[PDB]
Amino acid sequence: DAGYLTRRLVEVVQHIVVRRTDCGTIRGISVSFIQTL
Amino acid sequence: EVAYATFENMEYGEDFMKPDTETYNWVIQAYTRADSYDRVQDVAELLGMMVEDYKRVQPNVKTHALLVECFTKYCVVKEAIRHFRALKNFEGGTKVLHNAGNFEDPLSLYLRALCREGRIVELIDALDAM
Amino acid sequence: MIDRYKHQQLRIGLVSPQQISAWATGEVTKPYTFHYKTNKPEKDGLFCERIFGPIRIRRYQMGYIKLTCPVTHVWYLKRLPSYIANLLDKPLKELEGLVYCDFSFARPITKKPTFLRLRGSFEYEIQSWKYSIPLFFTTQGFEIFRNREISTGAGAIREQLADLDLRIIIENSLVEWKQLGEEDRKIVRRKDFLVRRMELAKHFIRTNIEPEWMVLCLLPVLPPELRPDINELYRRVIYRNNTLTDLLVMCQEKLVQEAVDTLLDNGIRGQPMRDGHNKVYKSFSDVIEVIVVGPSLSLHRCGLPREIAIELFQTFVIRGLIRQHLASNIGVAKSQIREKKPIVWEILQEVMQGHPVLLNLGIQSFQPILVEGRTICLHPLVMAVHVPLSLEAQAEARLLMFSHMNLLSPAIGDPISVPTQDMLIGLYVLTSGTRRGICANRYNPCEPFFCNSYDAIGAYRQKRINLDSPLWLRWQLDQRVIASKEVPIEVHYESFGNYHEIYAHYLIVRSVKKETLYIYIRTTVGHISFYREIEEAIQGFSQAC
């Protein structure tokens, strides 16, 4: 069950590559724990 | 896709590379005159990106002429009417849309599409601009 | 910067009969595979040398079968939802009987004159159409316009597809879609049918794909080298297709159509075709769908046996022999490797140095070294072996995949090579200090001093102290001892100005007259050894680099 999940997880994001320095977005996620920052 | 790759280089680059009004016009024109496949969704998303850049980018006469041409070709007539109204206020106006009769004469197609759909009040207003 | 633009595309599309012919020219016309007597490829057969090439071009040269009757492609008819049925706006039940049942479709075309009031699908046969009409117009004159009033088979479907007005489909679907909007499980279902139909029509208009290509007139044939099951299916299609052209019937067309369905995609009709040994035929749709620990090794190194290394690096050993003129050419260089000439192993060591290999963090890069024996030797913190050939691949292996630039795991950033098991107990025993309290003294109490750490370690080597026996260490650095943040247990204050501060782990001597500050740490040689090992490791690396 772990291998089948890993294959599907890799497949759904296999195309994601860091391609730009800054997309120039304005929005951000508000946070109000240390490891997630 | 060739022109859109260059546009993405500019849109997600540094400040001195950011698209201007002319940059949007070239990429819009590339999709409007594509040889194959449906491109109306690509043009409409580019228009949304241009509108989100209003604080820095504003349209000119070519922007509305290309958008009237695109929406007329795909028979999105109500959107072609919105951009034709904005095209009226620019001097020269309908002549730019005419394109000297090239690219299947977008000026005539706009007039034909209004006639085919019984939008006569809009049709007369188009003739006034001409 | 300007991106290095790279525009590459690939597309799939349905193939015209003309493109099928252009692939082959090449027609396979005989169901023969190989001659029994000569054991040669039969002329004009599935392995014909004039069609596919002499016995490398047989891996890539296509052929084709010229069908006497057109057959529908089973992908676009039976796989639900059907494309042909959706485009023609006819239920698959009433359209499947036109292919596999004894039905006939009236008025298949609309772009040519007709003079009969027949329409739709006729499950029976028209009585007058059998005798009266062929007699009145004569048989020769009847055949000209026969397949314009009522037709049968997959050919009737192709005429409907070829005569479709795709722009009429879009307008009819749109007005019907809006009519249902002005007006419960059928209305929603019918709306989805109309949206799919108008979406399908639009794609045909803006592409070069013709909808009539969904009915096959020619059948492309796989190259022989890719079919050294499929061959039997090909013979079955050829056999029935040759039978049908000899008759020239409808029952024979069904046999040709069914055989092509089996070849293209079996298991779509129900019980699939099976051979004599009770095996279901596979269509094209089915086709497309030792290590030994070495503790002395470095983290970036591995040990390879001679027998394995010489095979992996044979090309480099041959070049090394030729370069240094130990072998005249390629042929001589092989014999020395074959005969285990001792000069081979000297060259093997040279070419292996500086050439990393990939071992399969499941796959990493190590610098191989020749080891005695027959086993692969790996360091305790770690079978396929890959040798990078190009300089681009060798650069990546050394600079990206080595076992020292990947010390942190990407999941949360934890270290990967933390000591475990026997490594961990050794540190635990080493740093487990002296016994304390009632475990150190039988009775309630109502140790050596070392000038430097090297004297303490030297006394331990001479068996003068034990590994966990407490001692005092003269400390000539800053107070960097991790300890409980506690005030002194006792302060001994001499009347001349010097006072001793006794802490749980160290003693500090100070004065109110001088600026002296002397520190003595109560520790063991185990703690000293652990501190020295890390410090000397840092100092040794700095000096060597």
Return all residues near C274 (Cβ < 8 A) that are at least 6 apart: C280, C281
Cα distance between residue C244 and residue C252, in whole Å: 6
Question: Cβ of C167 under 8 Å from any chain B Cβ?
Answer: no
Q: How far is C3 from chain B (nearest CA, A)?
A: 7
Question: Cβ of C10 under 8 Å from any chain B Cβ?
Answer: no
**Residue B100, CA distances (Å) to B35, B66, C411 in order:** 20, 14, 61
- Taking an 8 Å cut-off on Cβ atoms, the answer to whether C202 and B36 are in contact is no
Q: How many residues does chain B have?
A: 130
Neighbours of C223 (CB within 10 A): 16
Are the C-beta atoms of B46 and B25 separated by less than 8 Å?
Answer: no
Are the C-beta atoms of C316 and C308 separated by less than 8 Å?
Answer: no
Are the C-beta atoms of B28 and B66 separated by less than 8 Å?
Answer: yes
- Bridge partners, C304 (sequence order): C370
Residue corresponding to tokens 């045909």:
C204
Question: Cβ of B37 under 8 Å from any chain A Cβ?
Answer: no
- Bridge partners, C498 (sequence order): C511
Resolution limit, Å: 2.5
Q: How far is B12 from chain A (nearest CA, A)?
A: 5
H-helix or E-strand spanning residue C500: strand C498-502
Q: How far is B73 from chain C (nearest CA, A)?
A: 13
Task: Identify from B12, B17, B54 which residue to disrupt to test chain A contact, counting A C-beta atoms within 10 A and taking the largest count.
Answer: B12
Question: For residue C168, how many C-alpha atoms fall within 13 Å in the half-sphere facing its CB?
Answer: 6
Question: Nearest by CB to C7, which of B1, B36, B37?
Answer: B1
- Taking an 8 Å cut-off on Cβ atoms, the answer to whether B9 and C206 are in contact is no
The full 3-state SS of A1-37, as one line of letters, equals: CHHHHHHHHHHHHCCCCCCCCCCCCCCCCCCCCCCCC
Look up residue C327 and give its two tokens.
């072998």
Specify the experimental method: cryo-EM
Neighbours of B11 (CB within 10 A): 20
Q: 3-state class of B46 per DSSP? A: helix
Return all residues near C463 (Cβ < 8 A) that are at least 6 apart: none
- Report chain breaks in chain C, C–N > 2.5 Å, as residues after which they occur: 25, 55, 183, 228, 248, 289, 360, 382, 446
Residue corresponding to tokens 């309908």:
B94
Find the radius of gyration of the CA atoms of chain B.
15
Are the C-beta atoms of C226 and C62 separated by less than 8 Å?
Answer: no
Q: Is A29 annotated as a binding residue?
A: no
Cα distance between residue C255 and residue C504, in whole Å: 98
Could you say which DSSP state residue C282 is in? P
Give CA C349 to chain center in angstroms: 35
The torsion region of residue B100 among left (phi > 0), alpha (psi -120 to 50) and beta comes to left
A 1-37 → B contacts, CB under 8 A: 20, 22-24
